[PDB]
C-alpha cells in the first residue's frame, strides 16, 4: 500500500505538475472541515499490489 494515486481533485493537472496535498475533498455542499465522512473523501487511494 505504499503506492497511492490521487482519486478526487477539483481540476485536471497542468502538464508536469505535482500536487501532494492530502486535504479531504468535499464532494457535497456541506463543508468537511478536515473530517472525512458523508460527501467527504480522502483524495488518495492505494493500489495494494499483490
Amino acid at each position: 500500500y505504499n503506492y497511492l494515486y490521487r482519486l478526487f481533485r477539483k481540476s485536471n493537472l497542468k502538464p508536469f505538475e505535482r500536487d501532494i496535498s492530502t486535504e479531504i475533498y468535499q464532494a457535497g455542499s456541506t463543508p468537511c472541515n478536515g473530517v472525512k465522512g458523508f460527501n467527504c473523501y480522502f483524495p488518495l487511494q492505494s493500489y495494494g499490489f499483490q
Partner: antibody
Amino acid sequence: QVQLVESGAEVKKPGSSVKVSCKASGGNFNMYTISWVRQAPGRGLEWMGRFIPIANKANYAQNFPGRVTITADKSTSTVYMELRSLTSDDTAVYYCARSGSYDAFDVWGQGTMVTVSS
Amino acid sequence: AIRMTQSPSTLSASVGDRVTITCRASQTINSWLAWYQQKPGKAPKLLIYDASNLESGVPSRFSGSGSGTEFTLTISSLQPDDFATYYCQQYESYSPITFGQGTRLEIK
C-alpha cells in the same frame, strides 16, 4: 514527532478475550499502517497483524487464523487490536508499530503487558 | 510464510571490535529487510531499512549489506551502548511478517 500511546496492562484468564488500543498522535493517520508486534518473555518478536488506514482494510498473520480482529476509529486516530481465545502462551507485550515511509517500524508504541493466567 | 534465520543466535564481543551478524532468509526477499535493536525493557528501535540504508538518528557505526537471501549487519566500532538483541524483518510479504530469532550481543 509522532508518538504512539497504548492502553494499560491487562490481566485476563485463559479462554477470555483482550482488546488493546494504540492512540496515534501527530502526523497523518490516513497514510501510515499500524502493525501489532508481540514478544513473549524469553522469545523473539512476533508479528500479529496490520491495520491499513488508506484502504480501510485489516490483515492478520497466517499463524493466527481468525484469532486477531483489528479495527480503528479514524475520527480519534485510535487503533484497536482484538485477540480472542487467550491461553497461557499469549502472555506477551503487545506493541503497536507504525510502518511509515519505508514500510519499516520506525515508531514503536510503549507496549502493554498482557498477562493471561488463572 | 517466509522463514528468517539468524546466525549467530548468541554472540559476545568487546568494546571497539568488529561484530558481524548474519540473518539469512528462506526465499528471495530482494532488499526488503530491516534491522532493529531491542534493549531489555524497551521497545525495539529501527536501525537499518532496505537492508542497506541507515535510519535517521542512528550512529554511523552501524552498516548493513547483502541482498536476495543472505543479509549482514556489521558494527564498525562496537560501543557499550550497542549491547542488545538485534532482529531482522522481512517486509516483502505481509502474510505473515517474520522477525529474526534474536541475536543477543554480550560483553566479552
